Amino acid sequence: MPHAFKPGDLVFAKMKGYPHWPARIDDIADGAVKPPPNKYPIFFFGTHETAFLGPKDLFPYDKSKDKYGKPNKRKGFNEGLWEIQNNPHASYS
């Protein structure tokens, strides 16, 4: 059965106005800004942006890839597909 989301989990993450996007749940570095309560830090592959999102916007990658893991016109999306599939745990700083 499902656990709660943890750092390192891979997802497609949904933001208003964008397609479901390949992403991971990030760690918070020592000394770094924490997310609001109930939110997770989401690192979006390809764009390398971070936003804070709740579970309602988080779709487990294995379950969802057949639906959402298709090329898209948007900036950074296809790069993001490569990253999530080929090196999802790398440092992208």
Curated annotation (Swiss-Prot):
Top-rank lineage group of the source organism: Eukaryota
Lineage: Eukaryota, Metazoa, Chordata, Craniata, Vertebrata
Membrane-crossing residue ranges in chain numbering: none
Protein known as: Hepatoma-derived growth factor-related protein 2
Subunit and partners: Interacts with HDGF. Interacts with trimethylated 'Lys-36' of histone H3 (H3K36me3). Interacts with trimethylated 'Lys-79' of histone H3 (H3K79me3), but has higher affinity for H3K36me3. Interacts with IWS1. Interacts with H2AX, POGZ, RBBP8 and CBX1. Interacts with histones H3K9me3, H3K27me3 and H3K36me2. Interacts with DPF3a (isoform 2 of DPF3/BAF45C). Interacts with SMARCA4/BRG1/BAF190A, SMARCC1/BAF155 and SMARCD1/BAF60A in a DPF3a-dependent manner.
Location of this fragment in the whole protein: 1 to 93 of 671
Segments forming domain PWWP: 7-64
Family designation: Belongs to the HDGF family.
Function recorded in the entry: Acts as an epigenetic regulator of myogenesis in cooperation with DPF3a (isoform 2 of DPF3/BAF45C). Associates with the BAF complex via its interaction with DPF3a and HDGFL2-DPF3a activate myogenic genes by increasing chromatin accessibility through recruitment of SMARCA4/BRG1/BAF190A (ATPase subunit of the BAF complex) to myogenic gene promoters. Promotes the repair of DNA double-strand breaks (DSBs) through the homologous recombination pathway by facilitating the recruitment of the DNA endonuclease RBBP8 to the DSBs.
Tissue distribution: Widely expressed. High expression is found in heart, skeletal muscle, ovary and testis. Overexpression is frequently observed in hepatocellular carcinoma samples.
